[PDB]
Amino acid sequence: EETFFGNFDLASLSLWLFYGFFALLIYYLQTENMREGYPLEDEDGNTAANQGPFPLPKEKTFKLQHGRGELTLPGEDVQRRDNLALRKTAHGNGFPMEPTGDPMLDGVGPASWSKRRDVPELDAHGHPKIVPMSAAEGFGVSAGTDPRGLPVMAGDGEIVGLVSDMWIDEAEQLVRYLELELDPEWGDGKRLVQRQMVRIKSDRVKVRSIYGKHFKNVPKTKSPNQVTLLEEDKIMAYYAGGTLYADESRLEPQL
C-alpha cells in the first residue's frame, strides 16, 4: 500500500479520527454527569469563584407515572435541608464541621437524611410497593429461618423486644423491613429495621449499630400499613448514624 505523505497510510488516518472522536465522547460523558449538585459553593453557603473547566449541560425532561408531573434537570435543589445544627471549626475552607447538639437526633453527619417526597413508592398497579406480611395474599416463608417471634438483641447486649412482623416487596418478592415490638422498659410502640442491618440466628436477632437506649428514638411511621420515602430515609439514616455516634470509642482514633 502507498502513503499520502511520509509514513501516512489508512491506519494513521483512522487512528487520528478515533482520537478526535474520543475527545468529543469524553466531553459529552463528563457533561452528562453534572445534572445534580451544581453550581458549587464555598463552606459559608455562597457561590464559589471557581466553577471548573466544563460548562453546565442543557435541560432534559422526564415524564413520571401515576400523574406525578415532570422533572427538569439541572434545576433548583428541591432535596435541600433548611436548618442544620452544625458549626464551623475554622475561618477558612477545608476543615470539618462540629455538631451543635445531638447528631443522631438532628440528622447530621452519617445520620443525614435527604428530603424526599412524602408519598410511598408505587408498583405497576398503582398500589404501595412495600406492604406488611399480614396483608399480603398468598405469601409465606419458603427457605431460611423464620425470624417472627424471636427476641431482638441490641449492640451493647440488651434484649429490647420481639419481632412481630415482616414488611415485604410484593413485586420483587423480597423482604425489606423487620418490625419490632418494644418492651415497656425500652420504649413504647413498634419500630422498623432495614433487612440489611440485622443477622438472623437460630434463637435471636442481632442489631449491632445502635445500643439499647437508642431504640426509643427511632423515627416512627405515620400509618401502620405504609411508609413514605421521607420516613424511610429518616429511619435508615438513624440506624446508620450509630456506627459512629453510638459510643465515644467508635469516633476517636482506633490506632
Partner 1 sequence: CAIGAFVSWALREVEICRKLGMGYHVPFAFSVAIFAYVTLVVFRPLLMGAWGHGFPYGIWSHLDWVSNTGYAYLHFHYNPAHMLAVTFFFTTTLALALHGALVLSAANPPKGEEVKGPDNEDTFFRDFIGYSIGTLGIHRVGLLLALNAGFWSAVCIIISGPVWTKGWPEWWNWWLEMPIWP
Partner 2 sequence: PEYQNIFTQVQVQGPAELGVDNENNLTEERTTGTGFSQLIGWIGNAQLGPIYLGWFGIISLVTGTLWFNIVGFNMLSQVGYSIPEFIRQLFWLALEPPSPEYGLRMPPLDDGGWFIIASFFLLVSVISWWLRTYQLAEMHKMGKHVAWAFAAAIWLFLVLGLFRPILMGSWSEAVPYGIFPHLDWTTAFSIRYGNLYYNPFHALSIVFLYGSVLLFAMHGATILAVTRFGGDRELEQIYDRGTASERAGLFWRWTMGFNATMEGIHRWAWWFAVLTPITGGIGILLTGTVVDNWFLWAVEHNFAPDYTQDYGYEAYTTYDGFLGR
Binding-site ranges for partner 2 (CB under 8 A): 1, 7, 9-11, 14-15, 18, 25, 29, 32-33, 35-37, 62, 64, 71, 79, 112-114, 116-117, 121, 124, 133, 136-147, 166, 168, 170-175, 194-200, 208-209, 229, 232-233, 236-237, 239-240
Distance CA 69, CA 160 (A): 44
| Alpha-carbon gap, residue 48 to 38, rounded angstroms | 11
Query: Residue 196 and residue 117: Cα distance in Å, rounded?
Result: 23
Q: How far is the CB of 254 from partner 1 (least distance, A)?
A: 9
Beta bridge partners of 16: none
Any idea what the Cα angle at residue 6 is, between residues 4 and 8, rounded to 5°? 55
Residue 168 binds partner 1, judged by CB under 8 A = no
The nearest distance, CB 241 to partner 1, in angstroms, is: 7
Strand partners, 61: 72
174 binds partner 1 (CB under 8 A): yes
Question: Interface residues for partner 1 in 209-248 (CB under 8 A)?
Answer: 240-241, 243-244
DSSP 27: H
Nearest residue to 120 via CA among 46, 160, 73, 177: 177
Q: How far is the CB of 246 from partner 1 (least distance, A)?
A: 12
Would you give the binding string for partner 1 spanning residues 118-147, x where CB under 8 A is met? -----xx-----------------------
The answer to whether the beta carbons of residues 235 and 218 sit under 8 Å apart is: yes
Q: Which stretch binds partner 1 (CB under 8 A): 50-58, 99-107, 169-177, 210-218?
A: 169-177
With respect to partner 1, which residue has the nearer C-beta, 194 or 243? Answer: 243
Q: Rounded distance, CA 200 to CA 192, Å? A: 15
* Rounded Cα gap, residues 70 and 146, in angstroms: 42
- Does an H or E element contain 106, and which? helix 103-106
Q: Which does 123 bind (CB under 5 to 8 A by kind): partner 2, partner 1, none?
A: partner 1
Which element (helix H / strand E) includes 17? helix 10-32
x/- letters, 62..101, toward partner 1 (CB under 8 A): xxxx------------------------------------
Count of positions on this chain that bind partner 1 (CB under 8 A): 15
Binding footprint of partner 1 on the chain (CB under 8 A): 62-65, 109-110, 123-124, 171-172, 174, 240-241, 243-244
